[PDB]
């Protein structure tokens, strides 16, 4: 019920290109011994969690 803004082929190529450079720039440092970022994908066998 409104008009979506539609890209020219050229407009897309600009957008893609800029994005790819912004993206490849921001190499941010991480802690490879910290599993937060992926915590919800560790099954409890891997969490190996609390007791004895």
């Amino acid at each position: 019920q409104f008009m979506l803004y539609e890209e020219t082929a050229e407009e897309r190529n600009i957008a893609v290109h800029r994005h790819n450079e912004i993206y490849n720039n921001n190499n941010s440092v991480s802690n490879e011994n910290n599993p937060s970022q992926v915590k919800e994908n560790l099954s409890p066998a891997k969490i190996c969690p609390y007791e004895r």
Binding site: F2, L4, R12, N26, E40, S43
Partner: protein, 305 residues
Amino acid sequence: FRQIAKVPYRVLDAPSLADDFYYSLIDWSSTDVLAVALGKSIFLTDNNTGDVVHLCDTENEYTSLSWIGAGSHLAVGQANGLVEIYDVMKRKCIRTLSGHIDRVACLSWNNHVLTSGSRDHRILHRDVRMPDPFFETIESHTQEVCGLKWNVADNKLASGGNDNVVHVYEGTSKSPILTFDEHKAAVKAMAWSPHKRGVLATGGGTADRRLKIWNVNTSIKMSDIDSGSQICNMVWSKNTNELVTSHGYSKYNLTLWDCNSMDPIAILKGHSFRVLHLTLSNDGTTVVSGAGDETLRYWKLFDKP
């Protein structure tokens, strides 16, 4: 206290359907078209025809999708942060939106506003009629934003992070009006009640497992229930005051909740991977579930109104 079938009425093969908690790759449009992201491809099924359309591939990975209000356009996110919009009738990519610098795990529409949330820590509001990639940026999570649900009737957004925090915003506003950080785990599964404005459901991950119901705009936790397993997805019944939660570790079920009493009505079994992907049919009768077991299951759960 009413009868509810224990077996799906349709099972579709969904090869390559992701087994990643943070994805939710299955959406049923207001025009009755089911959209599903399988690895590097997106497929559509007409529920009325049984017709299958294969639009778009990527060298990357598809990572989120959300139908526009009217069901004419599909919004699609990628692992590299790119967000694109597809004209489904035309089968062409209408536009290509930058802004994110890391995967876009969640997307949500409020009419002409499209909103994306990413593993950079940002949420972006985008005027979809405008030539600008985005008009507002929100950095209120300190980890991946993995849940995002607009109200539309209320003018309210909910966001849920891997930082275990939930925020509620008034419209397109940069600062949240409310913050709930009780949960002890990721909050990806959240849903607004269509029956009562300002009511929000949120569900925690492995270390939390809780279903909480919040009365926003009065600031009260109306309910809080140990569901006993990781909550991975969620859907509020349109035709009835009931909630469906889908589960990960260590119970791969859907559970159907009453809401008036906060009691489980039924537990739906079958999936052999966590039930990560979930969506409600446009007529409100059917819930489709998906898992890394590469199946989509159709559960007839509700009646006409």
